[PDB]
Write a protein that binds this ligand. Structure first.
Ligand SMILES: [Zn+2]
Ligand SMILES: [Zn+2]
Length: 72
């Protein structure tokens, strides 16, 4: 259930508004959903301000399963 299926490889940049947030903004639905923000840690979702904006993506190869290694 928590595995990649209809998606591709993605890696957050690490220098955007999202990646620069190591804490909970405390004002977005996700954060406010936390007890410390009045919530109840029931929704405990990814902070809207934390979610990366720019990540490295690449086409999937689960359907092709081609080869791209140093065959020898
Ligand atoms: Zn937030
Ligand atoms: Zn980022």
């Amino acid at each position: 259930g928590g595995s990649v299926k209809k998606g591709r490889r993605s890696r957050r940049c690490g220098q955007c508004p999202g990646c620069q947030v190591p804490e909970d903004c405390g004002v977005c639905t996700n954060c406010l959903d936390k007890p410390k923000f009045g919530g109840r840690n029931i929704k405990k979702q990814c902070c809207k301000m934390r979610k990366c904006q720019n990540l490295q993506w690449m086409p999937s190869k689960a359907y092709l399963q081609k080869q791209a290694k140093a065959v020898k």
